[PDB]
From a paper:
LARP7 is the family member showing the highest sequence similarity to La, with the characteristic La module in the N-terminal third of the protein. However, while La binds all nascent transcripts synthesized by RNA polymerase III via their shared termination motif, UUUOH, LARP7 binds almost exclusively to the non-coding RNA 7SK. The 7SK-specific 5′ cap is mono-methylated at the gamma phosphate of the 5′ triphosphate by another component of the 7SKsnRNP, MePCE (also called BCDIN3 in Drosophila). Together, MePCE and LARP7 bind 7SK on both ends, thus forming a stable 7SKsnRNP core protecting the RNA from exonucleases. Following a short unfolded region containing positively charged amino acids (1–27), the La module comprises two structured domains, one containing the LAM (residues 28–111) and the second, an RNA-recognition motif (RRM1; residues 120–199) according to a global analysis of the LARP superfamily.
The crystal structure of the LARP7 N-terminal domain, described here, is the first 3D structure of the La module of a member of the LARP family different from La showing the linked domains of the La module in a complex with RNA. The structure was solved from a crystal obtained in a drop initially set up with the hairpin HP4 (300–332). Indeed, difference Fourier showed densities for only three and five nucleotides in monomers A and B, respectively. The triplet of uridines at the 3′-end of 7SK binds into the cleft between the LAM and RRM1 domains. It is constrained in a characteristic hooked conformation, allowing strict recognition of the penultimate uridine, with a contribution of the RRM1 revealing LARP7 specificity. As was observed in La protein, the penultimate U-2 (numbering as in La) is anchored at the bottom of the crevice, and U-1 (the 3′-terminal uridine) at the surface of the LAM domain. The uridine U-3 stacks on U-1, leading to a characteristic fishhook shape of the backbone. The base ring is sandwiched between Phe44 from LAM and His138 from RRM1, in a pocket closed by Tyr153 from RRM1. Interestingly, the present crystal structure of the human LARP7 shows RRM1 to be smaller than the standard fold, with a β-sheet of only three strands. There is no additional C-terminal helix (α3 in HsLa), but helix α2 is one turn longer than in La, and extends to the last visible residue, Asn188.
Author numbering: 29 to 189
Write the structure that this text describes.
Amino acid sequence: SRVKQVLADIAKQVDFWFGDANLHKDRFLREQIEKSRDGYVDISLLVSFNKMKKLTTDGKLIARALRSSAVVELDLEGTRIRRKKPLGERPKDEDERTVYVELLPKNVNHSWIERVFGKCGNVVYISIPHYKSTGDPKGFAFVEFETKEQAAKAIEFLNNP
RNA sequence: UUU
């Protein structure tokens, strides 16, 4: 079903925005959870994000998508989401798992990098840096992989065609 | 702002 997939895609993005890797990088969301201290950010906040906007504007639907989720739980009324497992120390191994890659224009987005790099391991985080002042792509990307073993399977593709 |  088309709904089946929309529901699967809300859950894959929210299981990301709260997922270890993204939480360690982006500060804004990390500011929201700490600046409440009870955990729990409103699903209101999530509807305001550009990647959520593309899927749904209804929050009750988001609550449905997160019933089955390893991370992120809801509490009494399907209005707020907390991590469900606490976030601690930022992993020092990060650098050994991340991979520098020089890309072809124009910015080629997350959808092209996930495609080519999924072939050698579960892609945890992608970073396409843009210059402050002018939102211009710096020509590169940073692809984090879970397992330093998957990381090498990509620097192997650095030598292959 | 994959806030």
